[PDB]
Design a protein around this ligand. Structure first.
Ligand SMILES: CS(=O)(=O)N1CCC[C@H](NC(=O)[C@H](CCC2CCCCC2)NC(=O)c2ccc(CNC(=O)c3cnn(-c4ccccc4)c3N)cc2)C1
Length: 302
């Protein structure tokens, strides 16, 4: 948790990024950021380039429940310091309105980004190479490796929750179901609670057991998305109820559970890596440290 508030007066509004029931998110430029690096604000300045940030701000009439949610979000983010996890650059909480300041990631979420690209075919819109797709996936695995060392379970890892900056940089975040774009990826259970069942390991669906090992299962599905260039939903031909049935077949283990198929042009050894992420026994799934090393090496030799 920061020792001091970010100085509100240094935030120069530029545009609205998004709007919600109890707050807004604004794109802002920071005046003279070099002054603030000396005070342990984690700002990365260049020379002739302005410093842009995203600022989430509570509305002055926000309910008590919304203020509670905001304060807990600040607490969680204050712990996480890694190049591939979204970063809390500062807060304004000594007075109202409450603010949190994060990285500005100009290329949007990774689903939006990959849906706008085509795979490069060097043997023959904007394109992306197979090595770069592996570099993207390696960055996701490195961020999850960090969360694993803190014993922090993400519970909703997917491309829609990864953000893209300059030079193909990736940072993991969590937007939940708060944007209306991805409602088809969530299954409603109890009341307002929803579950991203197509990314969830069998023990999450049947018993609600969420662990780092189930984050590895979700990473397998996320890797499948990346190699599909986000062109199709996992198990797209099957209903939500059929995906839940499949979790039951993993539990019964009588050889009738089904798997995501191998993406077009996906190397066989890489499909086998996904399959290991979907092992029935959580202790047989690979750890994030091993997934990172594997993908980083292939990114350089492919
Ligand atoms: C019931 S719940 O608990 O599960 N819940 C449901 C609802 C969500 C809750 N999310 C959390 O608490 C987690 C923090 C914890 C999380 C833990 C795992 C590791 C990642 C961090 N907040 C976040 O990630 C988070 C927080 C603040 C911002 C503001 N910045 C932008 O918006 C932002 C930047 N650039 N552009 C952008 C720029 C140009 C084009 C497009 C986009 C933005 N639009 C963004 C993300 C969780």
């Amino acid at each position: 948790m920061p020792r001091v508030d970010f100085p509100r007066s240094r935030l120069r509004f530029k545009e609205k990024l998004g709007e919600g029931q109890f707050g807004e998110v604004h794109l802002c430029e920071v005046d003279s950021p070099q002054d603030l690096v000396s005070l342990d604000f984690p700002l990365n300045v260049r020379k002739g380039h302005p410093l842009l940030v995203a600022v989430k701000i509570l509305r002055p009439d926000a309910t008590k429940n919304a203020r509670n949610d905001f304060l807990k979000e600040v607490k969680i983010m204050s712990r996480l310091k890694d190049p591939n996890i979204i970063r809390l650059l500062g807060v304004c909480v000594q007075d109202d309105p409450l603010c949190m300041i994060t990285d500005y990631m100009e290329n949007g979420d990774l689903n939006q980004f990959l849906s706008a690209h085509q795979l490069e075919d060097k043997a023959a819109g904007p394109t992306i190479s197979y090595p770069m797709l592996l570099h993207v996936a390696a960055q996701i695995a490195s961020g999850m490796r960090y969360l694993a060392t803190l014993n922090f379970v993400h519970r909703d890892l997917a491309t829609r929750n990864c953000l893209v900056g300059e030079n193909f940089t990736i940072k993991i975040a969590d937007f939940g179901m708060s944007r209306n774009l991805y409602a088809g990826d969530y299954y409603r259970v109890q009341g307002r609670a929803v579950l991203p069942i197509r990314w969830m390991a069998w023990e999450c669906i049947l018993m609600g057991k969420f662990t780092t090992a189930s984050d590895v299962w979700a990473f397998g599905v996320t890797l499948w998305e990346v190699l599909m260039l986000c062109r199709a939903q996992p198990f797209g031909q099957l209903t939500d109820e059929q995906v839940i049935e499949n979790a039951g077949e993993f539990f019964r283990d009588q050889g009738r559970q089904v798997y995501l198929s191998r993406p077009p042009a996906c190397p066989q050894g890489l499909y086998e890596l996904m399959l290991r992420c979907w092992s029935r026994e959580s202790e047989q799934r690979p750890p994030f440290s091993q997934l990172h090393r594997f993908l980083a090496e292939d990114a350089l030799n492919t």
